[PDB]
Amino acid sequence: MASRILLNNGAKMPILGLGTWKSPPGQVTEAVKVAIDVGYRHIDCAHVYQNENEVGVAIQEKLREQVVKREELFIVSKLWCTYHEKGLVKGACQKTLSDLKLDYLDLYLIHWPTGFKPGKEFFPLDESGNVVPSDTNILDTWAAMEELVDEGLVKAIGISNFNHLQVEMILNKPGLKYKPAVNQIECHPYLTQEKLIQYCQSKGIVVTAYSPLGSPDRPWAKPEDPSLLEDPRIKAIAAKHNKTTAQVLIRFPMQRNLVVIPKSVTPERIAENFKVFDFELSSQDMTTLLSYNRNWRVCGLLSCTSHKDYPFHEEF
Ligand SMILES: NC(=O)c1ccc[n+]([C@@H]2O[C@H](COP(=O)([O-])OP(=O)(O)OC[C@H]3O[C@@H](n4cnc5c(N)ncnc54)[C@H](OP(=O)(O)O)[C@@H]3O)[C@@H](O)[C@H]2O)c1
Ligand SMILES: O=C(O)COc1cc(F)ccc1C(=O)NCc1cccc([N+](=O)[O-])c1
Hints:
This protein is an alpha/beta fold. It has one domain. The chain is built from ten helices and ten strands. Helix 1 packs parallel to helix 2. 43% of the residues are buried. Pfam families: Aldo_ket_red (PF00248).
């Protein structure tokens, strides 16, 4: 299938990107270099991942080598929760730009709808372990994101982990200047997200699926959790197509008109994961994979469940 999807800012976004959460700083430079060498043109980053400097070393070296041109890359980062304040957004974006070695981002996302108290800690806590909120609302944070477009720092802005009512709040914002281009959400066969995806797509917002392999390296994994990569039903579909389970899990969101961002630091897997443009899942395969939904989430924190903007109390 076609490699890029058209966004509502008029730019094209590669439907396959490389994830970088948990990629160790001593491995991620080589991972990104390999990824670019084997065809990746989209890298998903974030300040909170603590490895943007090292991602940037790889990007800058592949630009210097003229393996790629800057206009052929699609670099995404995200505004962390402790920077939702009007006066902090530009500096947060600039720190990311400096670290990534870039003079603009292709896409900058509000990482989570929950704003936290600014400071050095990424998760400021009270003495009982609840996150300490900011009083800055999502609409004022969105206005600050719009400024970044108007200053040339970012080509597109979007959101991540927003539920449909939160997306709707953005879309209904008085004086809205730029619609979100993307909502980046968790999505895989155990969390299929039909309702939220349909809503976003109906509004022209492109959905990016994160943790498409079920994030087997997530730090809070428990032995009893379900495992996509080991699910015999998914392995069977992969065997029928002579592809790996990971390749099926990556192709699945692609055929739903989603962008997908599998993470790896393993060179062989980085290359394997890109070899997904040359086979098709049938409609029956797609519906079968959708049938595995169990509303199982990788990402979501106990410490945030009383924040006024916690996204996962709503059904979708
Ligand atoms: N917006 C958000 O709030 C948010 C939240 C979560 C994730 N994300 C983004 O989405 C990206 C992907 O999600 P994720 O990192 O949670 O997990 P994931 O991509 O679902 O899974 C990554 C894990 O799968 C392994 N893996 C990769 N390719 C494989 C293959 N072909 N065969 C077997 N195992 C394979 C990786 O191992 P190795 O690396 O050891 O090869 C790693 O342990 C993140 O890195 C981040 O960029 C965003
Ligand atoms: O948020 C991501 O992209 C992946 O997960 C993390 C990555 C990090 F580097 C550090 C922490 C997380 C993490 O716990 N992320 C989960 C998370 C964050 C913020 C708010 C909530 N919430 O439920 O409202 C959940």
